[PDB]
Amino acid sequence: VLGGGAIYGGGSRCSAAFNVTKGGARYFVTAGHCTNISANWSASSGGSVVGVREGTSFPTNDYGIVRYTDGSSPAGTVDLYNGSTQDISSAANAVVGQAIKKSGSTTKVTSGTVTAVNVTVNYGDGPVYNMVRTTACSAGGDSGGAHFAGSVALGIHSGSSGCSGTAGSAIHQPVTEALSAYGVTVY
Template identity: 30%
Template sequence: MHNITKRTLLGSVSLAALGSLAMGAPAQGSDSKPVPKPVTKVDTSVLAKEAAARVTTPANARAAQQHVQAAIASYVAKHGTKYSFGSYLDAKTGSVVVLSDAPAAVLSKLTDTSGDRAAAGATVRTSTSTITDQWNRKDDVAPFYGGGGIAASGGICSSGYAVNYGTARYMVTAGHCFANGTLVKTESGANDYGYVAWRRLASLGHGPKDMEIIYNKSYSPRIFTGGLWSTSSAAVVGAGDAVQGYTNYCHSGRTTGENCGHTAVDVNAQVCTQTGCKSPVVAFNGGTLSQGGDSGSPFYVKSGTQAWIRGHVIAGNGGTMSWAEKWGKVASTYGVTIATS
């Protein structure tokens, strides 16, 4: 349980009435927990640093990546999800890297780009690794923050970030977490978190995506920061897609807490797990990476107590590489905007 100082109840604060989904969900009501004061000045200096870190990749390497990703997606569509695959383009070496637990013979065929003239001269490296959806902070109260533990039907994930859809506000998380219509609770089980809708998942035929929304409660444009039992948070002040090469992205989930120092190795990566192939996604490494239960947690760039959303965590291989769904895909899929403080 969080300490009462997490967001001490100081009085009644009225929240604007929020709309409902077309599926007939009830409108959100008001809460008695105070909302932190709106941010009056946004420090954008970190965005210039992020943009300056952008790296470019050779055309033949990008062509090789596209060739390999298409081959992997086709293989998974035909043979199922017995094996896992994660691929990205390492801009520092110009090599396409494929992490997988598939047999060498399978990988050899999938990574053969010899017949692709556009990929001539490109290098493809493989490494043995098992990649999984990251199932598995703890006792939030409304209005709910991103980065908290959420649970239903035996599964545990992390909340992501709040979005606006017209006058309604929802919370985003990973699509492999819960089925449509599921009542989600806080990890402690003490509070209802809302219902799942608009699930988009590759294995369900929704294209290479991994996202869903939670509705019917109030959700704050803030994300938890600090450790597993931290009461601290950052104000969300914007959103956009990650920049390849930037070296200080963060994630904040119920399993590993907040961790920064992540490098966006590739922003056109692919990851294929037991819930299908998702792309383009962000492949990131460096620092303490996400673990089981961090799925859905926000992936962001931070400056002081302000955060810019770049997506949400969807997969990892247990310590050397993780993958995040891109904010741009969420925005275009749902027609939403980021909720800001």
């Protein structure tokens, strides 16, 4: 699956953030509230399993990782939903004022500006810490999608408080914390 692409588990749709690697093996990271629901993930609702969960953390954080088990070696890119893709080649933390994009499977690519970093967000399940607030529009099914700027991976889509027009509220989990948690790098 490419970054921003749909993934299905537990009868729900989420989105993948980025393809990552360690030890010559391929994995994708996504939202923890998505990997909490299921161990097996497919690229269509009743499709064959492409990967199995190897870790998850939600609430407190919101990230998780799925190991590919179907023998594929996907490109390390994010789907721009227009026939093309964005190559990702590094990861960093977002900064206030930075223009970002997110790609997820419900609203495809939307854009916004980072308004705050290191934010605690209270969801119904509990608080998630050290989050990033943006003005990018989003909707259910977009969690786990890629927050990025050019070839730089910045975050994993977690949630929002709504959107009207272009004025969104997409919140992301910093991707660097998930990459260190699992000892993985983007490629």
